[PDB]
Amino acid sequence: ATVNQLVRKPRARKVAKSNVPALEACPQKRGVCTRVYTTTPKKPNSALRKVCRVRLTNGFEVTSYIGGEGHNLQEHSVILIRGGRVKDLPGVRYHTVRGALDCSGVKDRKQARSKYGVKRPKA
């Protein structure tokens, strides 16, 4: 506190971490699907969450949530991840981009539509 104590040993700032360490300060990374599966979330929630397991180009082997209603993913599919965690699934730090490189968009969607990779329907 005192002015001799801050000369001999200055104030030190806490080096903050990141919660998306596999992106490595990149916006998106291309990965290869290795297992598609479902998972029940933690309590109080109850569903069957659709989430895959991706091998990233930089070498990291992470799980990645597949958003929206229904998809077309298999093993050995090549998709693009973005970050942002799903809270109620412990261990999922990444989302997938719908509409990028193997993943098709959500079918029959008309609202919040850019988020789900759907071309604009003409009416």
Partner 1 sequence: KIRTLQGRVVSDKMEKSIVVAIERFVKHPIYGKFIKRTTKLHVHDENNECGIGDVVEIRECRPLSKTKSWTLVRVVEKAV
Partner 2 sequence: SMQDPIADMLTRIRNGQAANKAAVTMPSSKLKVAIANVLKEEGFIEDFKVEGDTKPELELTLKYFQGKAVVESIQRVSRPGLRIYKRKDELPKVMAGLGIAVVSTSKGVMTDRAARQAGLGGEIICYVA
Return the number of the residue (21 or 61) whose C-beta is nearest RNA: 21
Q: Which of 94, 42, 98 minimizes the C-alpha distance to 64?
A: 94
Edge-to-edge order in the sheet of strand 61-65: 78-81, 29-39, 49-56, 61-65, 94-95
What's the token pair of residue 37? 């599966």
Contact positions with Mg ion (CB under 5 A) in 42-81: none
Rule CB under 8 A: is residue 4 a binding residue for partner 2? Answer: yes
Taking a C-beta distance cutoff of 8 angstroms, is the pair 36, 76 a contact?
no
Binding mask 84-113 for Mg ion (x = CB under 5 A): ---------------------------xx-
**Region binding partner 2 by CB under 8 A among candidate stretches 2-10, 38-46, 86-94, 97-105:** 2-10
Number of residues that bind partner 1 (CB under 8 A): 4
User: Which parts of this chain interact with partner 2 (CB under 8 A)?
Assistant: 2-4
